[PDB]
Amino acid sequence: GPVIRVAGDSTAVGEGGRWMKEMVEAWGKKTGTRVEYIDSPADTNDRLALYQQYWAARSPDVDVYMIDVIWPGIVAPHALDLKPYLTEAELKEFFPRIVQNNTIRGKLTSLPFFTDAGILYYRKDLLEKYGYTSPPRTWNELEQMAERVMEGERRAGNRDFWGFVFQGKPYEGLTCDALEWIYSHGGGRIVEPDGTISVNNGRAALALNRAHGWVGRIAPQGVTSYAEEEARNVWQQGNSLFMRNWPYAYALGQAEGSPIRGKFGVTVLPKASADAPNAATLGGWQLMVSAYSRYPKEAVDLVKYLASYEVQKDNAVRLSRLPTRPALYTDRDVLARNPWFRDLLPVFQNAVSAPSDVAGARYNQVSEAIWTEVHSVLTGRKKGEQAVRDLEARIRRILRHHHH
Numbered sequence: 001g002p003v004i005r006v007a008g009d010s011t012a013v014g015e016g017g018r019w020m021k022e023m024v025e026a027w028g029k030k031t032g033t034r035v036e037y038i039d040s041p042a043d044t045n046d047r048l049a050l051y052q053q054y055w056a057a058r059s060p061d062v063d064v065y066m067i068d069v070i071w072p073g074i075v076a077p078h079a080l081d082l083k084p085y086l087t088e089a090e091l092k093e094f095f096p097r098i099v100q101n102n103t104i105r106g107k108l109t110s111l112p113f114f115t116d117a118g119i120l121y122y123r124k125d126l127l128e129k130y131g132y133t134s135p136p137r138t139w140n141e142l143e144q145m146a147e148r149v150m151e152g153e154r155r156a157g158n159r160d161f162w163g164f165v166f167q168g169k170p171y172e173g174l175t176c177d178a179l180e181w182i183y184s185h186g187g188g189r190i191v192e193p194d195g196t197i198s199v200n201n202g203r204a205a206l207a208l209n210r211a212h213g214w215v216g217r218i219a220p221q222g223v224t225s226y227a228e229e230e231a232r233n234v235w236q237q238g239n240s241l242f243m244r245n246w247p248y249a250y251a252l253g254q255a256e257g258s259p260i261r262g263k264f265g266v267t268v269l270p271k272a273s274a275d276a277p278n279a280a281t282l283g284g285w286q287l288m289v290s291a292y293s294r295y296p297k298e299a300v301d302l303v304k305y306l307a308s309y310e311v312q313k314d315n316a317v318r319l320s321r322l323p324t325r326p327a328l329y330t331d332r333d334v335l336a337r338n339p340w341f342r343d344l345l346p347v348f349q350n351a352v353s354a355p356s357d358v359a360g361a362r363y364n365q366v367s368e369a370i371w372t373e374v375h376s377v378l379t380g381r382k383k384g385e386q387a388v389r390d391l392e393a394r395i396r397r398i399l400r401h402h403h404h
């Protein structure tokens, strides 16, 4: 009978790939359907380039793809419209914001699978050791805490210890980090939902200059090459006071044999001042059935299973990744394992999207301009002032003649 082949999450990021392969294999066993799992590279933009090869070929060799929240406008032609397969009641069990994200020109490109938001990880033991009673609310406070804690830990003999790790590699994750910096300084959304390219302003320039000021100081020089896992591994070994990352790192840090089990908490990222907006970049993944699948019925059944309450529950409990079903945020077991899902739910609700809606199918080009200009600041090659000016010019060229 058919073999349903899934290009799923990466085994190179935490447990996400191993876990998803397990869920796909469980579906195959429950239904008596043969399955195969196709692994992916860690970085989202590398995944996009890989899947674009299959889509260009109209390849039947993948039935289901796990797609980024930033991709529906890019990937829609390659998606089977799921709308005819779900009832209105079924579709209302997911967050409407994500269903809307996934719907392009009325086509439901994909089912919401897990959501994501950038958050601040902090070492509670170290804050207490150095006389701090709360995590930092402003970036200045973050820098002050990091300077003091680093000085003390270095003096105590940990030469591997840093104050802050984050994603500074030139790839999509830096666009995500940089949206948080810029928005939390009151510098806007880079490209606003209305189409205005707003990034050439002094608050956005300051945000980028501030992040440059971290590199080689409170953050490793090598942060300019870090994606999610590089930052996590410094943090997880016990060697960073603070980390900016996504929800998946929490469960990994709590695993038996983690050096930092029981030593950390999470909160909203800091901001420039009390009246700036809180910033958490909206991430997350969706489940798409290929327009090129020879087995759409079976593929749809697998995607519904993966997006189901029980599978999302397992993702939450075991991998600390955020459900797309509001009902799971009140589930007793989800909450007992991850009480911060409740504490941070307003952060998740107010997360700021990258400019994928407005850029549509040109989003990857826009994002490449963003991360490259941002990276030039982090390396000390350009000042923020010049970079936001250059970035404006680039995005103007990229989006010229694009309408949304």
Ligand SMILES: OC[C@H]1O[C@H](O[C@H]2[C@H](O)[C@@H](O)[C@@H](O)O[C@@H]2CO)[C@H](O)[C@@H](O)[C@@H]1O
Binding pocket: 009, 010, 013, 016, 042, 043, 044, 068, 069, 070, 115, 116, 172, 173, 174, 176, 228, 246, 248, 282, 283, 284, 285, 321
């Ligand atoms: O790097 C930007 C990318 O980060 C997040 O995606 C991660 C996800 O958190 C992990 O659990 C795992 O699935 O790997 C993904 C790719 O590194 C965001 O979800 C995504 O929106 C964002 O583009």
